[PDB]
Design a binder for this molecule. Structure first.
Ligand SMILES: COc1ccc2c(c1)[nH]c(=O)c1sc3ccccc3c12
Length: 273
C-alpha cells in the first residue's frame, strides 16, 4: 500500500490536476512527491504495455523514465477506489521557475541560456521517447538549486508524439500558438517551438509576452527589458506566426545565442549558491 511504504509530509500543491504532497520513501529516506488524482476528474486515459488501463500521464511517465534526463521520473504508482497515486522524484532543495522568476525577476542572459538549453535537451528527450509535453512553461519546470539542474513536470496535458494534426489542447491560453487560436489545429514540434519562444521571452523579460488572443495573432513582441540583439532574434523566430517559419530544435540549438552554455554546477555556483 501507499500508506505503508511512504511517510506522508506536507502538501505542496493543489488544483485542476490534483493534490501533491512531499513524502519520504521509508525503505531508504528518499525524498518523493505523492500526486493524487480522482478518477472522476481524469480527462484522458491510456493503456500500458502490460495491458492495464491507466491515465495517460502514467504511460508517458514510464516512456521518458528510461535512463537519466531532465524529466522528473516515476518511481511507483497505486490505484485506489476513486483515485490513482503517483510517486515521483522530489529533489531537495527545489523551486519552480514560475516562483523563481516571480521572486528574482528577469534572468541574466547567461542564466537563461543555461536553463533554456536544459529545457531543450529535456524536450528532445521526450520526443525521442514518443512523448509530446504540450504544456511547456515556467510552472512546469523545477530547478534543483544545488545541482543547477532543470527538470520537467506534469504530463496531464501531454500526448503521444505524432506527425498528423492535433485538435485538442488542455494547456494554457496565453502559451497557445496562433494556429490553435485561429483554426483549432497544430502540429506538436512546431507548437512546442512556439511555447519555447514564449518561455525564452519570460526568462529574459520577467513576464510572458502576450496577454490576449489579439496580441497572439498580432504576432508582435515588444521587449520591456534590455535584451541582446541576438536573443530577440531567436525569440521572434520561435514566435514566427506561420509554423513552417519557426525553427527546429536543431536550428534553435545552433543559433548563435545558444553558444557557450554553462554546465549545471557552474550555473548554480554563479547564479544559485
Ligand atoms: C503549485 O503546483 C505544483 C507544485 C509542485 C508540483 C506540481 C504542481 N506538479 C507535479 O507534478 C509536481 S512533481 C513535484 C516533485 C517535487 C516537487 C514538486 C512537484 C510538483
Amino acid at each position: 500500500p501507499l500508506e505503508s511504504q511512504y511517510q506522508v509530509g506536507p502538501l505542496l500543491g493543489s488544483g485542476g490536476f490534483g493534490s501533491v504532497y512531499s513524502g519520504i520513501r521509508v525503505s531508504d529516506n528518499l525524498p518523493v512527491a505523492i500526486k493524487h488524482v480522482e478518477k472522476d476528474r481524469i480527462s484522458d486515459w491510456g493503456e500500458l504495455p502490460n495491458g492495464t488501463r491507466v491515465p495517460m500521464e502514467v504511460v508517458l511517465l514510464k516512456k521518458v523514465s528510461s535512463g537519466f534526463s531532465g524529466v522528473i521520473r516515476l518511481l511507483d504508482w497505486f490505484e485506489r477506489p476513486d483515485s490513482f497515486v503517483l510517486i515521483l522524484e522530489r529533489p531537495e532543495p527545489v523551486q519552480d521557475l514560475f516562483d523563481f522568476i516571480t521572486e528574482r525577476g528577469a534572468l541574466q542572459e547567461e542564466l537563461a541560456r543555461s536553463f533554456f538549453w536544459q529545457v531543450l535537451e529535456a524536450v528532445r528527450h521526450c520526443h525521442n521517447c514518443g512523448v509530446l509535453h504540450r504544456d511547456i512553461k515556467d510552472e512546469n519546470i523545477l530547478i534543483d538549486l544545488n545541482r543547477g539542474e532543470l527538470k520537467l513536470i506534469d504530463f496531464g496535458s501531454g500526448a503521444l508524439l505524432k506527425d498528423t494534426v492535433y485538435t485538442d489542447f488542455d494547456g494554457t491560453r496565453v502559451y497557445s500558438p496562433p494556429e490553435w487560436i485561429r483554426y483549432h489545429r497544430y502540429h506538436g514540434r512546431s507548437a512546442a517551438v512556439w511555447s519555447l519562444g514564449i518561455l525564452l521571452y519570460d526568462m529574459v523579460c520577467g513576464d510572458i509576452p502576450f496577454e490576449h488572443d489579439e496580441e497572439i495573432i498580432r504576432g508582435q513582441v515588444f521587449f520591456r527589458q534590455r535584451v541582446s540583439s541576438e536573443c530577440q532574434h531567436l525569440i521572434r523566430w520561435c514566435l514566427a506566426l506561420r509554423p513552417s517559419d519557426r525553427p527546429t530544435f536543431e536550428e534553435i540549438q545552433n543559433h548563435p545565442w545558444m553558444q557557450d552554455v554553462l554546465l549545471p554546477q557552474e550555473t548554480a555556483e554563479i547564479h544559485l549558491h
